[PDB]
Design a binder for this molecule. Structure first.
Ligand SMILES: [Zn+2]
Length: 82
């Protein structure tokens, strides 16, 4: 019981209104991974009803970009500014 599937953040479908990424799952619900916890350094989407968990390859640059799209409170800048 660990994350043996790992999807790149770009493939994960992002819901800017929910401030999270989801992945289409057949069972009754879709995999859900919260940007809040992704920022915490943890990356794994859990699906309800079937109760599956999968890892998600995230990036610093992706988080910041999505943060603006999802309309979240400005995050602390990453070590990449030129
Ligand atoms: Zn599911």
């Amino acid at each position: 019981m660990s994350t043996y599937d790992e999807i790149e953040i770009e493939d994960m479908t992002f819901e800017p209104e929910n401030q999270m990424f989801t992945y289409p799952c057949p069972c009754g619900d879709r995999f859900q991974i919260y940007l809040d916890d992704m920022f915490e350094g943890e990356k794994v989407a859990v699906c309800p009803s079937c109760s599956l968990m999968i890892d998600v390859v995230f990036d610093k640059e992706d988080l910041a970009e999505y943060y603006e799209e999802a309309g979240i409170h400005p995050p602390e800048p990453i070590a990449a500014a030129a």
